[PDB]
Design a protein around this nucleic acid. Structure first.
Lengths: 157, 317, 50
RNA sequence: UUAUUAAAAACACAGCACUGUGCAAACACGAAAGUGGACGUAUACGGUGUGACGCCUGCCCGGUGCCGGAAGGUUAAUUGA
RNA sequence: CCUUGAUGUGUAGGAUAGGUGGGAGGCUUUGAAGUGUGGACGCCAGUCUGCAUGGAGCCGACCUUGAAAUACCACCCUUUAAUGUUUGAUGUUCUAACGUUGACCCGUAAUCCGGGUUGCGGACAGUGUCUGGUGGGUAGUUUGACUGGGGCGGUCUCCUCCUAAAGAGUAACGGAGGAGCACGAAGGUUGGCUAAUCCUGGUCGGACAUCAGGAGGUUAGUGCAAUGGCAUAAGCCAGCUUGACUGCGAGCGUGACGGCGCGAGCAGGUGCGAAAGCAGGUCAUAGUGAUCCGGUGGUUCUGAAUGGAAGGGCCAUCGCUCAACGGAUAAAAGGUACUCCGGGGAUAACAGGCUGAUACCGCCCAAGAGUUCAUAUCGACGGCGGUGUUUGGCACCUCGAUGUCGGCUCAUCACAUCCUGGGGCUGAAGUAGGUCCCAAGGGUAUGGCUGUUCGCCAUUUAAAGUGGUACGCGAGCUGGGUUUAG
């Protein structure tokens, strides 16, 4: 509706692209980014400062022509700034004590709602979780419980 | 009190939101504020545990159980001054502070509830047989047809504007002569309890006459055609001559020069609207013979005109 | 914007390629197009249209 | 108190409250020594808000600041399959 | 991390079923089903196992399970048991580093400092280099041009028609708009064909369904906004198709130029049709970005002693919301009434002369209302003029200075006259009146409110006039409003 209205909208997308290049390689693969865009990211930091502007012009160019919300939404989870991400972790730890203290009454909800949960391994993990807590041993396996639930949270496959 | 259990399971699309909202969609009949007060009452269990913090974030996999109570108009005994009562028409003199139709906040104690107590099966006719509305702060005559064929004839008469209605009012200012006012009216743009004159409003016609004047006030007789909500007040106020003692539509208090202490007390004592209906004319449903009735001047108006008569005869004379 | 720029490489062993644009969304199939190649002085097929 | 247009309702004021500070105290002046605080010791010192006295200071932790807790995710220098 | 053997209880179910393939058999007298302890897993629900007792054998679709096997052969996942390897983390003891603004002694008739003993901490704290985080506390900057306002916005490039005054070009806060694509077919060739709208007839079927017969040869269509063209059709359909090709390209046009467009024709290899010929994109005009610097391929082009290599160069190529679109940084938002400096009437406000949109004043046209009777008195729908003291805009400026509003003193001028004066008409009996004309000689108020101009009120007279005087008068006064600094 206004040429300058598009301008600030496009410029806002430009600084978003400048945030992707300023993000580490290990966390770069987390976002569902296409290979064509991904390949342009690695060349962006290794190019000289003036070429970064051209690369920033590149990154903005084919990022506007496609959908942006899933990329922005996925980036928000990694930054842990989207509201649904932090509450998801709240319920993820809310089912820990619901499961680590009983071990039988909490598995029903997980299997009924999530069909990719390996109940063969989950029961054994709770067996170790009960053993370490009862024997007042350091929680060397409690961390792995959260990783498995977190991994299955976003379709581990 | 209706003690009925209420247990439901929250779904997975209420993620990251509070407690008051979550129960609202799953229970459409109860909204957030109704849910809020019962949460503070320590009578709602979530996951088998009672909660005290309505601003908690609940996502899913929880079983909420509400174990508490839940819950046309009950008639009430109200004194009514019957003027004329028979099998077809009911003429009643409505006293002060009595609304003709109950609303949200007055389940019992109104004209309709009193008429229900006065005659139990009166609920058969719609609206218990009332045909026109009137302000509760204004006393006057009210007409109710007993039988339902009389309801059809009465509403059709007002559509053709056949029934004549008369009002007695007291206003401020030294009036000069009568006349007619024709100004469209709609709702006030800002305040929701005011019905102000609007050029693109509903067309309206009202006539006014004068019987005698006073110092800075007047006693006047007038006829109203359409009995809409507060029609008579605004059309009298659109000529910047507001009614005496009207708190909503009348102007700010303005005692006259050299007013006695008793006169100022009377305006304070007369803290209601200056309106009264004296003479009503109707056509009988199954006979076709006119009836005429008159309403005595209420005691507050008797002293109001008395104090103004003494003041006018003492200062100006 | 929606269009994706593509490169057409000769089916022969030479590395000479041509530049052009095709909409992948509507035509995802690889092109079967032959165009003149100066290095081989003949006409050669071009493939791998992204 | 604005020398040299504003002497006031402005500043300050004893009091009140919060917070920081266990002595080689906090803080300030100082590349540092060292000094002030103080040759004092939580009824002491510093910072902030208000400003006699009487009646009182109600609700809210959402964002920022502060404290504690850390279950978890991201994260450089470092080492070199 | 290297083998070492177990290890996987949602459910019906002989019952502590792990996923991916083969699978109706492998194993065993190089000595077995099934009975016991030892060690041990262990949710004692159950299971593995050295030993010999024992002296010749075990399964699997079985019906059921979402899923069928301790019938075996493998990649293996998780949990975990015991050695050896590597590296971390935590806790305890000590002193010899280090600290000690603890005590004591000496230099030393010394609250500095140093040296010595002891006590207390102690490899902590602290310090040096790098690094993560915080960091307007501090430092250097940026906040482009066009006009708008309580705060914010929009425009900057290209294209179409008109404005545009018949070569070209021609601006404005002039009126209408569009583009940042798309097409591997919607290009080329060859061949073929020609609609809107309406009449009659015709079934569900209607204002299109597709049409049979008709005036129309394009008012239809031409991917999209508009314009100009399009019948040889550029519009429509089908076969083949890549000329949307490589190196060029005389010549011309447009711009100051960078650039952009047209481009006959040559060499090669192609597609179409038999051939003559056409094809270097789309009917055309917007669909875009010069250079610097980055990725890829080629070029032994060069290769800081020799041979390489690294690097550089050339060519093609993808590389901009460089959108401020001839593109100052790769990297930058605001205020200053606390401001300052150098300039400008190149640029606002008040006043002055253009102006009459709006509104005030005069006149004319005169239907109608007016006891008869239009202008005795009004007068609807309109028109022509004048100061112009409201509400406005235009070029001219005193920014190296043009001091306000109001009050006091002082007045002056014009008459569109407030009184006095002379009259006309009167629906003017007299007084008292109303309108109009002439007449500026004189006079034309005192107090409360508010800084007031104005106005209200109180009270007099003949009234307490209207305007110019830059809405007079601060090199006469006043500083009450407006009033920098608190």
């Amino acid at each position: 509706v206004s040429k300058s209205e598009i301008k600030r909208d496009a410029e806002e997308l430009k600084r978003l692209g400048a945030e992707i290049v300023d993000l580490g390689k290990n966390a770069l693969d987390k976002i569902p980014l296409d290979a064509d865009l991904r390949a342009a990211i690695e060349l962006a930091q290794r190019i000289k400062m003036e070429g970064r502007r051209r690369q920033l012009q590149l990154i903005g160019k084919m990022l506007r022509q496609r959908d942006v919300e899933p990329i922005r939404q996925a980036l928000d989870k990694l930054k842990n700034r989207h509201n649904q991400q932090v509450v998801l972790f709240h319920k993820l730890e809310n089912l820990r004590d619901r499961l680590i203290d009983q071990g039988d009454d909490a598995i029903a909800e997980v299997l009924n709602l999530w069909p990719d949960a390996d109940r063969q391994q989950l029961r054994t993990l709770i067996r170790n979780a009960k053993k370490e807590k009862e024997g007042n041993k350091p929680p060397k396996s409690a961390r792995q419980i959260f990783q498995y639930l977190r991994e299955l949270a976003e379709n581990e496959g | 009190a209706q003690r009925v259990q209420l247990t439901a399971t929250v779904s997975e699309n209420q993620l990251g939101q509070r407690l008051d909202q979550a129960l609202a969609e799953m229970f459409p009949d109860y909204s957030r504020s109704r849910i809020k007060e019962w949460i503070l009452d320590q009578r709602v269990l979530v996951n088998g545990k009672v909660c005290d913090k309505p601003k908690e974030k609940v996502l899913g996999g929880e079983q909420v159980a509400i174990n508490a109570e839940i819950e046309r108009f009950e008639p009430q005994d109200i004194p009514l001054d019957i003027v004329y009562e028979d099998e077809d028409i009911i003429i009643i003199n409505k006293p002060r502070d009595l609304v003709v139709h109950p609303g949200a906040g007055n389940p019992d104690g109104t004209v309709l509830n009193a008429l229900l107590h006065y005659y139990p099966p009166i609920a058969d006719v719609p609206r218990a047989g009332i045909v026109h509305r009137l302000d509760k702060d204004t006393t006057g005559l009210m007409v109710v047809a007993k039988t339902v064929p009389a309801q059809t004839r009465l509403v059709e008469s007002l559509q053709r504007r056949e029934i004549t209605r008369e009002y007695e009012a007291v206003a401020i200012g030294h009036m000069t002569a009568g006349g007619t006012v024709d100004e469209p009216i709609s709702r006030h743009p800002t305040k929701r309890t005011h019905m102000a004159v609007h050029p693109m409003g509903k067309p309206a016609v009202t006539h006014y006459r004068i019987m005698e004047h006073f110092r800075v006030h007047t006693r006047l007789r007038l006829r109203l055609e359409t009995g809409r909500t507060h029609q008579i007040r605004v059309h009298m106020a659109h000529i910047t001559h507001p009614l005496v003692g009207d708190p909503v539509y009348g102007g700010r208090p303005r005692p006259p020069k050299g007013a006695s202490e008793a006169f100022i007390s009377t305006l304070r004592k007369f803290d209601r609207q200056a309106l009264h209906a004296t003479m009503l004319r109707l056509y009988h449903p199954i006979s076709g013979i006119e009836m005429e009735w008159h309403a005595p001047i209420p005691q507050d108006m008797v002293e109001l005109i008395e104090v103004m008569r003494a003041d006018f005869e003492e200062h100006k004379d | 914007g929606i269009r994706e720029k593509i490169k057409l490489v000769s089916s022969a062993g030479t590395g000479h390629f041509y530049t052009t644009t095709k909409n992948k969304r509507t035509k995802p199939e690889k092109l079967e197009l032959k165009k003149f190649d100066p290095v081989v002085r003949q006409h050669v097929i071009y493939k791998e249209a992204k």
